[PDB]
Design a protein around this nucleic acid. Sequence first.
RNA 1: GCGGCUAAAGAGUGCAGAGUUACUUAGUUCACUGCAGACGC
Length: 129
Amino acid sequence: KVFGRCELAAAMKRHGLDNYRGYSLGNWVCAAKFESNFNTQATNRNTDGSTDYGILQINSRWWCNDGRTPGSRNLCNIPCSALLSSDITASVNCAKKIVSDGNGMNAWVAWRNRCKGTDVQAWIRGCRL
RNA sequence: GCGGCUAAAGAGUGCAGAGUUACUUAGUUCACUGCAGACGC
């Protein structure tokens, strides 16, 4: 499914992505846009044969099982195909666990490239939440 | 009992809520529910 901007913001909050770990929902709305263009089917293959799944582009090298990455970890305990679904449940839990961890939100590249140090409020402007 | 209007403006608002993510550029304007008025033959 290709979420609209707000339709997403609403679904993200409604799972517990609003101001989780002290990061307002304007950072996750933006993160999904630059990462996947709100499209929950998006995929990109990296030069090393792993692939990025879902609305936030979560790597099969560590986080999920696609079958076609030998020496993959699957730390989120799911098939990478769950990261493609219209139901963002299993792409939030995993987006959560990635952030609740090491670099934190700097573990979000797209976020860290474009939205870190920007008024991430523009991304919620107009949205019935 | 079957249509347009009920916001100058606006893609979108007759008032009151609702929230099934449907629709949409998200919406005081939109799925659902209460009640509508002046009209047309």
